Design an enzyme around this catalytic site. Structure first.
Site, PDB file in Angstrom:
ATOM      1  N   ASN A  45       0.846  -1.129   0.061  1.00  0.00           N
ATOM      2  CA  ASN A  45      -0.057   0.122  -0.029  1.00  0.00           C
ATOM      3  C   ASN A  45       0.751   1.191   0.052  1.00  0.00           C
ATOM      4  OD1 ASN A  45      -2.260  -1.679   0.218  1.00  0.00           O
ATOM      5  ND2 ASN A  45      -1.829  -1.963   2.549  1.00  0.00           N
ATOM      6  N   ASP A  92       3.808  -0.189  -9.511  1.00  0.00           N
ATOM      7  CA  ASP A  92       2.687  -1.103  -9.814  1.00  0.00           C
ATOM      8  C   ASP A  92       3.204  -2.499 -10.155  1.00  0.00           C
ATOM      9  OD1 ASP A  92      -0.321  -0.997 -10.239  1.00  0.00           O
ATOM     10  OD2 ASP A  92       0.344  -2.152 -12.198  1.00  0.00           O
ATOM     11  N   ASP A  95       4.871  -3.713  -6.698  1.00  0.00           N
ATOM     12  CA  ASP A  95       4.010  -3.914  -5.366  1.00  0.00           C
ATOM     13  C   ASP A  95       2.951  -5.241  -5.702  1.00  0.00           C
ATOM     14  OD1 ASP A  95       2.343  -2.713  -6.931  1.00  0.00           O
ATOM     15  OD2 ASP A  95       1.810  -1.063  -5.626  1.00  0.00           O
ATOM     16  N   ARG A 100       1.621 -10.591  -4.092  1.00  0.00           N
ATOM     17  CA  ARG A 100       1.394 -11.948  -4.260  1.00  0.00           C
ATOM     18  C   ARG A 100       2.173 -12.898  -3.402  1.00  0.00           C
ATOM     19  NH1 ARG A 100       1.263 -10.495  -9.778  1.00  0.00           N
ATOM     20  NH2 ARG A 100       3.304 -11.606  -9.982  1.00  0.00           N
ATOM     21  N   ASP A 113      -5.306  -0.492  -5.548  1.00  0.00           N
ATOM     22  CA  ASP A 113      -4.841  -0.490  -6.890  1.00  0.00           C
ATOM     23  C   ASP A 113      -5.738  -0.026  -8.152  1.00  0.00           C
ATOM     24  OD1 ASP A 113      -2.905  -1.037  -8.886  1.00  0.00           O
ATOM     25  OD2 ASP A 113      -2.697  -3.263  -8.288  1.00  0.00           O
ATOM     26  N   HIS A 114      -6.954  -0.075  -7.913  1.00  0.00           N
ATOM     27  CA  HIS A 114      -7.891   0.427  -8.971  1.00  0.00           C
ATOM     28  C   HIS A 114      -8.046   1.880  -8.804  1.00  0.00           C
ATOM     29  CE1 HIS A 114      -8.666  -3.463 -10.517  1.00  0.00           C
ATOM     30  NE2 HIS A 114      -9.120  -3.914  -9.551  1.00  0.00           N
ATOM     31  N   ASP A 117      -5.063   3.521  -9.986  1.00  0.00           N
ATOM     32  CA  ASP A 117      -5.005   3.570 -11.518  1.00  0.00           C
ATOM     33  C   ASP A 117      -6.114   4.435 -12.105  1.00  0.00           C
ATOM     34  OD1 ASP A 117      -3.315   1.536 -10.906  1.00  0.00           O
ATOM     35  OD2 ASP A 117      -4.437  -0.099 -12.427  1.00  0.00           O
TER      36      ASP A 117
HETATM   37  C1  LIG Z   1      -0.254  -6.124 -16.270  1.00  0.00           C
HETATM   38  N1  LIG Z   1       0.907  -5.541 -15.565  1.00  0.00           N
HETATM   39  C2  LIG Z   1       1.432  -6.754 -14.700  1.00  0.00           C
HETATM   40  C3  LIG Z   1       2.119  -5.055 -16.702  1.00  0.00           C
HETATM   41  C4  LIG Z   1       0.475  -4.660 -14.681  1.00  0.00           C
HETATM   42  C5  LIG Z   1      -0.918  -4.722 -14.259  1.00  0.00           C
HETATM   43  O1  LIG Z   1      -1.296  -5.672 -13.333  1.00  0.00           O
HETATM   44  P1  LIG Z   1      -2.142  -5.694 -11.834  1.00  0.00           P
HETATM   45  O2  LIG Z   1      -1.539  -4.220 -11.148  1.00  0.00           O
HETATM   46  O3  LIG Z   1      -3.449  -5.680 -12.428  1.00  0.00           O
HETATM   47  O4  LIG Z   1      -1.666  -6.983 -11.043  1.00  0.00           O
HETATM   48  P2  LIG Z   1      -0.805  -6.977  -9.866  1.00  0.00           P
HETATM   49  O5  LIG Z   1       0.631  -7.814  -9.982  1.00  0.00           O
HETATM   50  O6  LIG Z   1      -0.602  -5.458  -9.153  1.00  0.00           O
HETATM   51  O7  LIG Z   1      -1.793  -7.831  -8.795  1.00  0.00           O
HETATM   52  C6  LIG Z   1      -1.483  -8.411  -7.637  1.00  0.00           C
HETATM   53  C7  LIG Z   1      -2.791  -8.577  -6.393  1.00  0.00           C
HETATM   54  O8  LIG Z   1      -2.169  -8.110  -5.348  1.00  0.00           O
HETATM   55  C8  LIG Z   1      -3.107  -7.314  -4.657  1.00  0.00           C
HETATM   56  N2  LIG Z   1      -2.675  -6.017  -4.060  1.00  0.00           N
HETATM   57  C9  LIG Z   1      -2.369  -4.833  -4.833  1.00  0.00           C
HETATM   58  C10 LIG Z   1      -2.003  -3.838  -4.414  1.00  0.00           C
HETATM   59  C11 LIG Z   1      -1.821  -3.673  -3.276  1.00  0.00           C
HETATM   60  N3  LIG Z   1      -1.188  -2.448  -2.613  1.00  0.00           N
HETATM   61  N4  LIG Z   1      -1.908  -4.610  -2.300  1.00  0.00           N
HETATM   62  C12 LIG Z   1      -2.259  -5.670  -2.788  1.00  0.00           C
HETATM   63  O9  LIG Z   1      -2.468  -7.004  -1.857  1.00  0.00           O
HETATM   64  C13 LIG Z   1      -4.232  -7.028  -5.696  1.00  0.00           C
HETATM   65  O10 LIG Z   1      -5.482  -7.889  -5.156  1.00  0.00           O
HETATM   66  C14 LIG Z   1      -3.923  -7.259  -6.758  1.00  0.00           C
HETATM   67  O11 LIG Z   1      -4.707  -8.107  -7.854  1.00  0.00           O
HETATM   68 MG   LIG Z   2      -0.668  -3.609  -9.500  1.00  0.00          MG
HETATM   69 MG   LIG Z   3      -2.423  -0.173 -10.764  1.00  0.00          MG
END
Ligand SMILES: C[N+](C)(C)CCOP(=O)([O-])OP(=O)(O)OC[C@H]1O[C@@H](n2ccc(N)nc2=O)[C@H](O)[C@@H]1O
Ligand SMILES: [Mg+2]
Ligand SMILES: [Mg+2]
Ligand SMILES: CCCCCCCC/C=C\CCCCCCCC(=O)O[C@H](COC(=O)CCCCCCCCCCCCCCC)COP(=O)([O-])OCC[N+](C)(C)C
Ligand SMILES: CCCCCCCC/C=C\CCCCCCCC(=O)O[C@H](COC(=O)CCCCCCCCCCCCCCC)COP(=O)([O-])OCC[N+](C)(C)C
Ligand SMILES: C[N+](C)(C)CCOP(=O)([O-])OP(=O)(O)OC[C@H]1O[C@@H](n2ccc(N)nc2=O)[C@H](O)[C@@H]1O
Ligand SMILES: [Mg+2]
Ligand SMILES: [Mg+2]
Lengths: 364, 364
Positions: A45, A92, A95, A100, A113-114, A117
């Site tokens: 975060n 992005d 993290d 994961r 994240d959303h 974005d």
């Molecule tokens: C396609 N990419 C890989 C180039 C970028 C877009 O990818 P993305 O951001 O949708 O996927 P990601 O690798 O961030 O998602 C990993 C997951 O970790 C979680 N997540 C995200 C942000 C955050 N601060 N803490 C989390 O726990 C969310 O559920 C997310 O879905």
């Molecule tokens: Mg992300």
């Molecule tokens: Mg993002």
């Protein structure tokens, strides 16, 4: 903010996405290498908040130096914007990878994240309008900002009517790479590169980006709309929550129609002299309308077409109905401030409620 | 139109009312004598339909002979209006008495009675505005029509928040008697009686009715509002259906505010040259909004603030926002026709559904 039943259905949520782009594997290896060298005690975060903060700050500086998107900016702002965008993309990816692993996944990270974005894409589109100096072509100026907004909200709308994220081949990665290289080239060669008209056809340089944008938009829109119609996961082609398939379409149609209606009856050129404020206000409005749908499809509830975010557009519309008693430059600022405050309040309340339920120490 | 649960709760409905006025006992004896001499095979619905038809026809004739409410009318129309009003009152009393006996009582008769009362009061107020020639005082011309509308809807609103009808001392009986004697006097002496200024104060004759109206309104409003606030029948002072006490207030406030907003920004004097059409259109709108509340408090359900009756006012408002492309005299007619058609459709559908459930042969 969230009822007990919705909060109960929040748990047992499995993130799932399928898709890949052309430039992903090399950058995938690069992101893996970089995340291999990150401290294990840092929370995702904080990383996403830092990335969003850097992107917003750099875009804000560039916007402040170029109101109306027809002046020029020095080396400083363009270099800062390119660095900020690259850092945002890197953070992005990193993290996401770091969330994961180390079993730190939670439903709150997805919401962060959303939202990040949404805000970042609004600010990036504003920056790419400001850098190209797309003010000498006033016709193609509503379209770019609100098609970026519409495209992201339609990506979310496609997500709502299905269960898995589908990634194209002209997705956000290529757009961000193109914008970064465009900022770098404009910096190194000067803002006047887009006034270096192509040896033929009498068309300026700016037609090279715009056309591509349109093409990309078409392709993107096509895919999304097909998943809206052919695909259905519920008892029928209906929504995963059991509601109608075309309900949030009313939300975005109302927002864009209100924006166009206020644009077309300004009588004082409200938009062409205050573009950044206009786009920022409606960007905050659509950011709230898009964060609502995020919680909507994370849970299985139903959305309404009545929110406390149309206060700004409502004031503009009802100040346009009555002919003119308050001048149309303070009302815009009031609307922007109200929308920003409402968005911040909603985000803070939702974050606090989810933290209280899940006892996750949001920043830790 | 009505859900299964609402239709189930429709049964086991007990009509109850308490109250009496000054002139009731003599006219009560008169109505008893007249109903003593009525055929036993006639249904009350036919009686109330005939009364409403006569009242509406006579008022329509008078309105057609006096658009804008500033010309004069002959003996014919005034005599016909007085006879029609007297016949309407007589038939209301008689069919009430005849429905209480011969065990023909049903929940449908109450709906017919209230709808007929709404339409009849709208038309009677229009007639009493037309006869007095209240067009030489343009200030006191919105007030009378819409205070009659507001007073009847507030009587219904008082009924919704309680369980029994409460009758005052300045209730509908005295108003109808005053209007009948006023029509008779204006007929016998001529329309110019209200231009026979009182020996003192330089004020014309028309101040004698208007002031009384205002006084009556005040008294009536007072009573209703007290029952709204002090009185409560549910678990608390709340509505009998368990909802908030001030919900239909939003409905009537929206209707009257929209009427005033369209009135004040006409730019072509929409109201002062087409008063009858304006009042009739908004009277049909409020008639539908008042019939909804009738079914609402007969059942125990909840009302919404979203109906397919704001089409007319919506067209007027959105034709006023855009400056002027369609002239503001055909839009009024379209709105009136749409409102009338919607009201007729709603009434027919509800009547047919209730007849199908209760197998009562509505007209028999
Ligand atoms: C396609 N990419 C890989 C180039 C970028 C877009 O990818 P993305 O951001 O949708 O996927 P990601 O690798 O961030 O998602 C990993 C997951 O970790 C979680 N997540 C995200 C942000 C955050 N601060 N803490 C989390 O726990 C969310 O559920 C997310 O879905
Ligand atoms: Mg992300
Ligand atoms: Mg993002
Ligand atoms: C100075 C000059 C102007 C002076 C005049 C002042 C006017 C001030 C009010 C302005 C409008 C406010 C509207 C408002 O809040 O209602 C909103 C709907 O808003 C809409 O539906 C949008 C309507 C706008 C017009 C669209 C045309 C196409 C609903 O607001 P709400 O019911 O309060 O929110 C409850 C929200 N929850 C609880 C349900 C989540
Ligand atoms: C020619 C010139 C004009 C050209 C432009 C054409 C415009 C045509 C549409 C005009 C408005 C129609 C509105 C409409 O139907 O919505 C209504 C709300 O309407 C309102 O809430 C009133 C809003 C009016 C403004 C108030 C300001 C104070 C709801 O309508 P609905 O949802 O369809 O009804 C469903 C009703 N049930 C099923 C729920 C019972
Ligand atoms: C106060 N008055 C008596 C002077 C007039 C107003 O009185 P009112 O019309 O409310 O009472 P009423 O005598 O019509 O009511 C008798 C009852 O018969 C029922 N009723 C009414 C009309 C009709 N066509 N069929 C019916 O069955 C209604 O439930 C009504 O409540
Ligand atoms: Mg009766
Ligand atoms: Mg009656």
């Amino acid at each position: 903010p969230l009822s007990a039943q919705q909060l109960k259905k929040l748990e047992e949520h499995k993130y799932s996405a399928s898709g890949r782009s052309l430039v992903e594997p090399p950058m995938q290896v690069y992101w893996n290498w970089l995340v291999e060298k990150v401290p294990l005690w840092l929370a995702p975060n904080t990383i996403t908040m830092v990335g969003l903060l850097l992107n917003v700050l750099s875009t804000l500086i560039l916007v402040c130096y170029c109101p109306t998107a027809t002046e020029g900016a020095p080396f400083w702002t363009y270099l800062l914007c390119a660095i900020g965008l690259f850092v945002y993309q890197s953070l992005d990816a990193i993290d996401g990878k770091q969330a994961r692993r180390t079993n730190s996944s939670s439903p709150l990270g997805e919401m962060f994240d959303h939202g990040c974005d949404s805000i970042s894409i609004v600010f990036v589109n504003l920056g790419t309008i400001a850098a190209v100096r797309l003010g000498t072509l006033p016709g193609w100026m509503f379209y770019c900002c609100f098609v970026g907004m519409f495209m992201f909200y339609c990506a979310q709308w496609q997500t709502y009517v299905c269960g898995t994220l589908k990634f194209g081949i002209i997705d956000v990665t290529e757009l961000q790479i193109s914008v970064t290289v465009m900022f770098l080239m404009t910096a190194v060669c000067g803002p006047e590169l887009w006034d270096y008209e192509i040896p033929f056809t009498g068309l300026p340089m700016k037609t090279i980006p715009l056309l591509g944008i349109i093409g990309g938009t078409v392709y993107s829109c096509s895919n999304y709309f097909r998943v809206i119609l052919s695909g259905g996961v519920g008892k029928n082609g209906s929504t995963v929550a059991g509601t109608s398939v075309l309900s949030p379409g009313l939300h975005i149609g109302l927002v864009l129609l209100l924006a166009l209606m206020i644009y077309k009856k300004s009588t004082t050129n409200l938009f062409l002299q205050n573009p950044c404020l206009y786009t920022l206000a409606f960007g905050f409005v659509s950011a709230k309308i898009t964060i609502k749908l995020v919680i909507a499809h994370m849970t299985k509830s139903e959305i309404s077409l009545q929110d406390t975010a149309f206060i700004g557009p409502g004031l503009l519309f009802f100040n346009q109905y009555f002919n003119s008693f308050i001048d149309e430059y303070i009302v815009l600022w009031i609307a922007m401030v109200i929308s920003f405050a409402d968005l911040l309040r909603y985000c803070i309340s939702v974050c606090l409620q989810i933290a209280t339920h899940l006892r996750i120490s949001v920043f830790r």
